[PDB]
Design a protein around this motif. Structure first.
Motif, short mmCIF file in Angstrom:
data_model
loop_
_atom_site.label_atom_id
_atom_site.label_comp_id
_atom_site.label_asym_id
_atom_site.label_seq_id
_atom_site.Cartn_x
_atom_site.Cartn_y
_atom_site.Cartn_z
N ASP A 34 8.52 7.24 -2.43
CA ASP A 34 8.45 6.34 -1.16
C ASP A 34 7.47 7.05 -0.09
O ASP A 34 7.15 8.05 0.13
N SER A 60 -6.04 2.76 -4.15
CA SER A 60 -6.12 2.15 -5.52
C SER A 60 -7.62 2.43 -6.06
O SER A 60 -8.46 1.89 -5.75
N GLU A 112 -2.84 6.16 1.09
CA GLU A 112 -2.80 5.46 -0.29
C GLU A 112 -3.89 5.00 -0.74
O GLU A 112 -4.42 4.00 -0.08
N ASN A 158 3.69 6.39 -8.77
CA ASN A 158 4.68 6.14 -9.80
C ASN A 158 5.19 7.34 -10.76
O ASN A 158 5.41 7.23 -11.68
N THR A 207 -8.65 -1.06 -7.68
CA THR A 207 -8.91 -2.11 -6.70
C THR A 207 -9.85 -1.57 -5.52
O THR A 207 -10.48 -2.56 -4.99
N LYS A 254 -2.92 5.01 -7.07
CA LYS A 254 -2.38 3.86 -7.93
C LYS A 254 -1.38 3.09 -7.28
O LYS A 254 -0.44 2.56 -7.37
N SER A 255 -1.89 2.53 -5.61
CA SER A 255 -1.05 1.81 -4.90
C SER A 255 -0.82 0.64 -5.34
O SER A 255 -0.03 -0.57 -4.91
N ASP A 256 -1.83 0.05 -6.43
CA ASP A 256 -1.81 -1.30 -6.99
C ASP A 256 -0.56 -1.64 -8.17
O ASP A 256 -0.25 -2.54 -8.52
N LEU A 257 0.17 -0.29 -8.42
CA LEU A 257 1.36 -0.43 -9.51
C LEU A 257 2.48 -0.75 -8.77
O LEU A 257 2.78 -0.04 -7.57
N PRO A 258 3.40 -1.54 -9.15
CA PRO A 258 4.35 -2.24 -8.46
C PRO A 258 5.52 -1.31 -8.62
O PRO A 258 6.48 -1.32 -7.40
N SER A 259 5.67 -0.57 -9.66
CA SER A 259 6.92 0.32 -9.66
C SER A 259 7.05 1.64 -9.08
O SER A 259 6.74 2.76 -9.95
N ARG A 260 6.85 1.89 -7.90
CA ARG A 260 6.79 3.15 -6.98
C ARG A 260 8.03 3.98 -7.12
O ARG A 260 9.18 3.56 -7.28
#
Ligand SMILES: Nc1nc2c(ncn2[C@@H]2O[C@H](COP(=O)(O)OP(=O)(O)O)[C@@H](O)[C@H]2O)c(=O)[nH]1
Ligand SMILES: O=S(=O)(Nc1nc2c(O)ccc(Cl)c2s1)c1ccc(O)cc1
Ligand SMILES: [Mg+2]
Length: 170
Positions: free
Chosen positions: A127, A146, A144, A86, A149, A118-124
């Protein structure tokens, strides 16, 4: 019967260098870790049948002009190059960290893994295909993770060990 691997975690402030390292070593996620703390951690793990001693430096300052940074880049055997998925600027910073390391090593053969944390964050903002393309251009793995998690945390570090082990045979 043990083999040592000196790993160095680099990346822009706030990408999760400490969170990744502390998740691997201590099995917890840190919400807010002082960005100036620079410590090393050691842990013994088995990877591909080999008992490995990981000696990991969690770097703090990322300054171009730092005698200590030159010294740890000389010492380090492999580099975990971390950006946050992000934060586009942190992805752009990766080129500079690689160049720094190549300069210090005077070499193209540098064991490195590109980590999009931070692959757990939805607002990438970065790409996965662009990060894969960058990694392909460098000839390095891309993972990638997290730290929150634990997704692929051990995998990122163990993949770097595998890179080192292979470069030793070349
Ligand atoms: N959501 C999420 N936050 C993270 C992750 N990794 C680190 N953070 C957070 O991002 C901030 C910076 O992490 P830190 O490990 O201190 O970054 P460093 O400066 O690269 O060492 C902290 O608030 C962490 O809790 C992750 O995988 N997911
Ligand atoms: O170069 S060092 O004197 N020690 C190091 N320890 C480790 C280490 O424990 C793992 C990997 C590397 Cl590259 C290093 S370099 C050093 C490096 C950074 C510091 O903040 C303080 C001392
Ligand atoms: Mg930190």
């Amino acid at each position: 019967s043990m083999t040592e691997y000196k790993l160095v975690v680099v990346g822009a402030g706030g990408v999760g260098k400490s969170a990744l390292t502390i998740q691997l070593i201590q099995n917890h996620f840190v919400d807010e870790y002082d960005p100036t703390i620079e410590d090393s951690y050691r842990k013994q793990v088995v990877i591909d049948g080999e008992t490995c001693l990981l000696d990991i430096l969690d770097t703090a300052g990322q300054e171009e002009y730092s005698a200590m940074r030159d010294q740890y880049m000389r010492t380090g055997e492999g580099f975990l190059c971390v950006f946050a998925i992000n934060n586009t600027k942190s992805f752009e910073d990766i080129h500079h960290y690689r160049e720094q390391i190549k300069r210090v090593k005077d070499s193209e053969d540098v064991p490195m893994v590109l980590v999009g944390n931070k692959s757990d964050l939805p607002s990438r903002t970065v790409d996965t295909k662009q990060a894969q393309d960058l990694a392909r251009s460098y000839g390095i793995p891309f993972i990638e993770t997290s730290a929150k998690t634990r997704q692929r945390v051990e995998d990122a570090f163990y993949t770097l060990v595998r890179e080192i082990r292979q470069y030793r045979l070349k």
